[PDB]
């Protein structure tokens, strides 16, 4: 009956941002204040709310979105951003109430030869809508010649790998990100607090 936050922050691997992972957290009594005790989070921004004002007011939905991106893209995890991540991978609504936690995962997610197992979407014919997920892999038409499923010049495969190395700089190091969404919809209550 406990709220299992341990699984969301202690995991061995995270999702790729293009195929980002969403987990519903329902039917749970939670303690939220003992999570902020970890002052090792390099990023911690909450929208429509202050970081210590949610122990009595409850909301019906709690989603744990999580993925990995590199240091220079973490700025895009916010309502109203642009860039490959914000527009082609993970987009937050403008009226988004929730929190954005990020921390540097270099000792975990990189290896000496490079760790090319996390991917992102480089190209897309239009921006995502908020919380849309695109897992398709069709050839991207970057020119006036139609690509016709075949790869070639101006006909690119839309997904790339991040190259994560321990000697990379901060803008190029892996950052694990978790977005908590507290939606204002109506349904029987699921999530409690301290």
């Amino acid at each position: 009956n406990l709220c299992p936050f341990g699984e969301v922050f202690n995991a061995t691997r995270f999702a790729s941002v293009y195929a980002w992972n969403r987990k519903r957290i329902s039917n749970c009594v939670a303690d939220y204040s003992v999570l902020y005790n970890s002052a090792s989070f390099s990023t911690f921004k909450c929208y429509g709310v202050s970081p210590t004002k949610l122990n009595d007011l409850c909301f019906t939905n709690v989603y744990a979105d999580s993925f990995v991106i590199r240091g220079d893209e973490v700025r895009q995890i916010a309502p109203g951003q642009t860039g490959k991540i914000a527009d082609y991978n993970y987009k937050l609504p403008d009226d988004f109430t929730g929190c954005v936690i990020a921390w540097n995962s270099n000792n975990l997610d990189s290896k000496v030869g490079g760790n090319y197992n996390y991917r992102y979407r480089l190209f897309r014919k239009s921006n995502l809508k908020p919380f849309e997920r695109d897992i398709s892999t069709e050839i991207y038409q970057a020119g006036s010649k139609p690509c016709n499923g075949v790869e070639g010049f101006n006909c690119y495969f839309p997904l790339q790998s991040y190259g994560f190395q321990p000697t990379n700089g901060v803008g190029y190091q892996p950052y694990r990100v978790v977005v908590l969404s507290f939606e204002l919809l109506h349904a029987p209550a699921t999530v409690c607090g301290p």
Partner: nanobody
Framework: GPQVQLVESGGNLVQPGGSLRLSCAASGGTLASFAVGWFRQAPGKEREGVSCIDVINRANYADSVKGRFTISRDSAKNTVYLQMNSLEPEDTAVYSC??????????????????????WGQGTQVTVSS
């Protein structure tokens, strides 16, 4: 996979004037982020690059094969193909695959100007004989 491996398949015994398509499967990352080249070493001779392709999908070829060989990219299968036409007996070699990563600030640079690659395959042998 902790490391990028490259496996070549398709090696066969074929006849002079034959054709053959070699493949280079990859695991560990998106091969569409790596520049890939093909090399051969005939019996007793030194390794030579024959063809390569970069992340913008432009090909380069050696003169011993220019007009006969075609390098091609199938990234839904995470592979690079090498279509070899008009095989003559002197194409008998072990055909190896090789790749290196292209980071974002270098996506326009070309290939077989990187004859040094960080990841190699073991090769699949092609024998051209009567």
């Amino acid at each position: 996979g902790p490391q990028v491996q490259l496996v070549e398949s398709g090696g066969n015994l074929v006849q002079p004037g034959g054709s053959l398509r070699l493949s280079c499967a990859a695991s560990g990352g998106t091969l569409a982020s790596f520049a890939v080249g093909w090399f051969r070493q005939a019996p007793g001779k030194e390794r030579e690059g024959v063809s390569c392709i970069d992340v913008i999908n432009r090909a380069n070829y050696a003169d011993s094969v220019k007009g006969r060989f075609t390098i091609s990219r199938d990234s839904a299968k995470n592979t690079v193909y090498l279509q070899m036409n008009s095989l003559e007996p002197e194409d008998t070699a072990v055909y190896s695959c090789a790749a290196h990563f292209v980071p974002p600030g270098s996506r326009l640079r070309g290939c077989l100007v990187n004859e040094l690659y960080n990841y190699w395959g073991q090769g699949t042998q092609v024998t051209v004989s009567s």
